[PDB]
Amino acid sequence: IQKAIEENNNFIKMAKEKLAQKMESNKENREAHLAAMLERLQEKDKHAEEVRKNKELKE
Amino acid sequence: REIVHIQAGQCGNQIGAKFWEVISDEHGIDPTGSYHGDSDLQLERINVYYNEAAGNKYVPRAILVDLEPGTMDSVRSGPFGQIFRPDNFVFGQSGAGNNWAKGHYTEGAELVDSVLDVVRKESESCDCLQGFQLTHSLGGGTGSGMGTLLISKIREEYPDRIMNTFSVVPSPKVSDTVVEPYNATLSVHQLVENTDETYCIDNEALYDICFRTLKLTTPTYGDLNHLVSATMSGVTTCLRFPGQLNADLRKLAVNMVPFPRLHFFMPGFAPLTSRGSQQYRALTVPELTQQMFDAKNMMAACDPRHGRYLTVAAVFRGRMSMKEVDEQMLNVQNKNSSYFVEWIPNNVKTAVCDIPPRGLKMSATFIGNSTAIQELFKRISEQFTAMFRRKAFLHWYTGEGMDEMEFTEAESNMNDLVSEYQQYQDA
Ligand SMILES: c1cc(CNc2cc3c(cn2)[nH]c2ccccc23)cc(Oc2ccc3c(c2)OCO3)c1
Ligand SMILES: Nc1nc2c(ncn2[C@@H]2O[C@H](COP(=O)(O)OP(=O)(O)O)[C@@H](O)[C@H]2O)c(=O)[nH]1
Ligand SMILES: [Mg+2]
């Protein structure tokens, strides 16, 4: 009976742990995916600043 | 000399209730527990199985055990339900799932101490307890797993008391689930150690009997249990009725069991009769003797001619010539003495009781300790191995804490038992 308790507990335990790192790894990846997208759009902003800026350096 | 009776599980409680129904009638006890018989012979040993209560009412010394409530609810609303002491209904709720592990290790373990409290309470009210008897199957989970746990714990608390069982051995012809060989093999190991007499009821012999002899095309468990309760009444007749000589369970066991592990008996009954179908012609002593010795009348599906009898007991009931009985019994042995071991002299014994059972003027009950019973254990071992070599359906058991090793162990012990029988078949 002790072995059965230990085995129901380890299964509950490893399932809790396997799920928790999955949800963390998914949190990390999705954030590192949206941030990369934003940062391409912000490099986009500087570039457009350099285009408006270069044009003023033209008169 | 009181006996304490225990019935465990679906099968154990259904046959067990029939036993109390049948003998309660034989002793003139009505479903209320009130005596309404004619003779005093049917009350002289009534203490063996019934406790006497206030109001001159008789209460079976019976404990009813299950891990699910369905079958025991059906017992109380049943033909003789009211007679049982209500404190002796001991039951859980989760069931055993036809799983020996659940009955023996997890679900049964939770419940067993409560059962033993009732056993102890019934025992301490016994002037001289002479043993216990259990009814149960080996194919399910409660009667098989928890029944053998009870037997282990009873032997711990009462190590010198006789323990006998009626054990319904599973068979694929009449079968509920595929794991029955697993549960039976695990149970048999326990029975080999902790019982003095085990009457092996093979559920397919009961089937073949109901079909081929009583001409019942679709027999139910109820038809099967009519045959069993006829045998249960027969083999306990000489304890329940004053007669030729009275032996307590120990003395009976001493003279039937030459080797401690070979205590698995082949029961039989003559005449074989179906419910309702009225028998009008009484049998002659020669007819009873031929039939009770005939393979077709045996309830363990084993050919007695494939082995040798170590001991035999026969219980005739009704008015008949004990001289004619002696001559007919001596005629069977002297005509087939090659199926009896020559090294246990005078190993066939007989008793007669004047009280016949309900519906028959005359009957005979057969108790055979034959080495042919090994065929029953060979069948279980083959079915066990067919699944076990692939570890099939074991997850049901490993999930309750069991290791493969306990199965290997159970398999090896039963193969030892088979080989032990073979030693004495060739001696
Ligand atoms: C008590 C006694 C017996 C009979 N045992 C016996 C008889 C004789 C013998 C050796 N042993 N040698 C003999 C020579 C001549 C005549 C008779 C005998 C069997 C028994 O088993 C059960 C188990 C569960 C039950 C049950 C009965 O009824 C309901 O549930 C219990
Ligand atoms: N003779 C007979 N056998 C039964 C009955 N019910 C179940 N069985 C047998 O017992 C096995 C199942 O065990 P079960 O009774 O469920 O054990 P439990 O879990 O202790 O109730 C099967 O192999 C059946 O053949 C019955 O009413 N009569
Ligand atoms: Mg069942």
Side-chain angles (χ1 to χ4, degrees):
Chain A
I1 188 161
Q2 276 166 16
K3 191 176 168 203
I5 295 176
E6 178 82 74
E7 236 148 320
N8 188 56
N9 282 343
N10 284 334
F11 172 83
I12 291 181
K13 167 166 190 286
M14 275 154 63
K16 205 185 189 98
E17 292 167 352
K18 191 186 288 183
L19 199 54
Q21 90 98 34
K22 267 210 301 188
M23 300 315 261
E24 184 77 359
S25 163
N26 185 276
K27 196 182 145 213
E28 283 166 8
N29 295 340
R30 203 188 184 240
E31 275 172 10
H33 168 270
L34 272 165
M37 193 179 74
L38 299 167
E39 247 164 302
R40 271 171 296 206
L41 289 154
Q42 305 175 3
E43 304 216 66
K44 194 196 174 293
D45 297 338
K46 296 173 212 69
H47 169 90
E49 293 293 301
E50 319 176 352
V51 193
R52 285 194 283 294
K53 172 46 85 188
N54 224 47
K55 180 195 177 191
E56 291 173 290
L57 202 163
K58 189 87 163 150
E59 286 88 334
Chain B
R1 283 285 265 181
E2 295 80 2
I3 285 165
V4 167
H5 163 105
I6 306 157
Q7 43 194 73
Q10 174 173 34
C11 175
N13 272 280
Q14 262 151 14
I15 71 185
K18 270 293 294 177
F19 166 80
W20 290 107
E21 268 170 44
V22 168
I23 65 155
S24 287
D25 165 85
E26 287 195 5
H27 289 279
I29 311 290
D30 73 341
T32 57
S34 283
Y35 174 66
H36 275 123
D38 45 350
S39 182
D40 293 328
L41 275 80
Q42 62 191 270
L43 290 156
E44 192 173 317
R45 306 294 279 124
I46 200 179
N47 61 284
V48 175
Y49 282 106
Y50 296 78
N51 271 111
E52 180 157 24
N56 210 13
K57 277 226 199 157
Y58 304 89
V59 184
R61 207 171 292 99
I63 304 144
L64 294 88
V65 182
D66 209 340
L67 284 174
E68 77 192 349
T71 304
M72 267 159 57
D73 289 326
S74 200
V75 160
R76 265 182 298 211
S77 70
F80 264 73
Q82 302 267 94
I83 184 159
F84 295 107
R85 179 164 291 150
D87 271 359
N88 288 16
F89 289 77
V90 188
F91 57 108
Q93 296 283 329
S94 51
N98 291 295
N99 188 327
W100 197 83
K102 296 201 172 192
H104 208 79
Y105 288 131
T106 59
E107 300 299 333
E110 245 204 41
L111 190 60
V112 65
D113 283 358
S114 312
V115 178
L116 287 160
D117 289 337
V118 183
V119 170
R120 192 176 310 105
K121 190 256 291 175
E122 288 281 6
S123 290
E124 66 201 17
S125 158
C126 280
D127 279 281
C128 192
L129 180 81
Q130 62 162 325
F132 309 84
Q133 58 186 49
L134 164 79
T135 54
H136 69 120
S137 73
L138 308 189
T142 309
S144 187
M146 203 189 152
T148 49
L149 179 72
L150 270 171
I151 283 150
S152 194
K153 296 202 138 59
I154 289 178
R155 197 173 177 202
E156 200 177 39
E157 193 174 346
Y158 314 84
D160 63 323
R161 298 292 105 208
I162 287 295
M163 166 73 70
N164 296 345
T165 75
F166 262 75
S167 300
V168 174
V169 169
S171 159
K173 287 142 92 183
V174 191
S175 175
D176 292 355
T177 76
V178 292
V179 297
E180 283 161 359
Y182 281 154
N183 302 327
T185 291
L186 293 161
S187 280
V188 160
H189 202 322
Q190 307 289 304
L191 300 178
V192 164
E193 287 198 343
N194 295 326
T195 71
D196 290 286
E197 295 177 7
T198 291
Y199 295 78
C200 309
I201 299 316
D202 192 336
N203 215 3
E204 67 172 320
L206 308 183
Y207 186 85
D208 293 335
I209 287 169
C210 278
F211 185 80
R212 308 191 205 168
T213 298
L214 319 185
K215 302 302 163 55
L216 304 174
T217 41
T218 74
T220 65
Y221 281 131
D223 301 321
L224 266 57
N225 298 342
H226 175 256
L227 302 175
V228 172
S229 55
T231 306
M232 296 186 293
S233 164
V235 304
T236 69
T237 288
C238 290
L239 298 157
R240 298 186 286 104
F241 288 118
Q244 287 175 289
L245 268 192
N246 277 349
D248 63 10
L249 298 178
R250 179 168 292 105
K251 180 184 282 181
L252 297 173
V254 168
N255 287 299
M256 276 303 274
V257 189
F259 305 108
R261 281 154 47 87
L262 316 187
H263 60 275
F264 295 93
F265 298 161
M266 269 165 50
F269 190 84
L272 283 175
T273 79
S274 47
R275 287 185 294 174
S277 85
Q278 258 173 33
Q279 155 160 341
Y280 306 127
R281 179 176 91 57
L283 275 71
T284 61
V285 179
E287 289 177 311
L288 279 180
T289 301
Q290 186 278 336
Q291 282 172 232
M292 93 185 307
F293 268 95
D294 182 34
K296 290 169 200 311
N297 290 62
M298 312 273 159
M299 304 191 165
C302 297
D303 202 338
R305 308 189 86 103
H306 297 158
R308 304 180 81 203
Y309 286 120
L310 303 165
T311 58
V312 179
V315 178
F316 298 82
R317 292 188 75 179
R319 254 208 292 285
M320 56 202 299
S321 174
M322 312 171 178
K323 154 159 200 185
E324 210 170 322
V325 169
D326 288 338
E327 291 167 346
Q328 284 302 320
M329 281 321 273
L330 296 171
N331 173 250
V332 164
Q333 315 170 51
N334 298 335
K335 185 58 180 288
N336 312 279
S337 49
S338 80
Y339 298 129
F340 297 83
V341 298
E342 72 278 19
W343 41 265
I344 304 192
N346 321 119
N347 57 353
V348 180
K349 292 317 188 169
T350 301
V352 175
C353 169
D354 301 326
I355 316 290
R358 173 65 30 171
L360 299 161
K361 258 164 66 201
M362 292 214 310
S363 47
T365 302
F366 177 83
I367 300 162
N369 188 355
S370 170
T371 60
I373 194 79
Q374 71 168 286
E375 297 187 318
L376 185 149
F377 300 122
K378 282 156 60 185
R379 283 196 297 270
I380 304 289
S381 192
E382 304 179 88
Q383 302 159 28
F384 179 100
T385 289
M387 299 184 285
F388 189 63
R389 71 200 164 166
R390 310 286 295 257
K391 310 294 163 253
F393 304 94
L394 260 55
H395 77 93
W396 295 125
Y397 302 84
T398 64
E400 300 304 298
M402 290 186 77
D403 200 76
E404 296 188 2
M405 195 51 237
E406 188 162 346
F407 279 72
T408 302
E409 232 137 314
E411 176 177 33
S412 292
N413 182 256
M414 191 146 79
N415 285 331
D416 292 340
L417 175 74
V418 164
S419 89
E420 198 177 340
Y421 276 112
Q422 194 58 59
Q423 161 185 12
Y424 300 114
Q425 200 169 281
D426 307 328

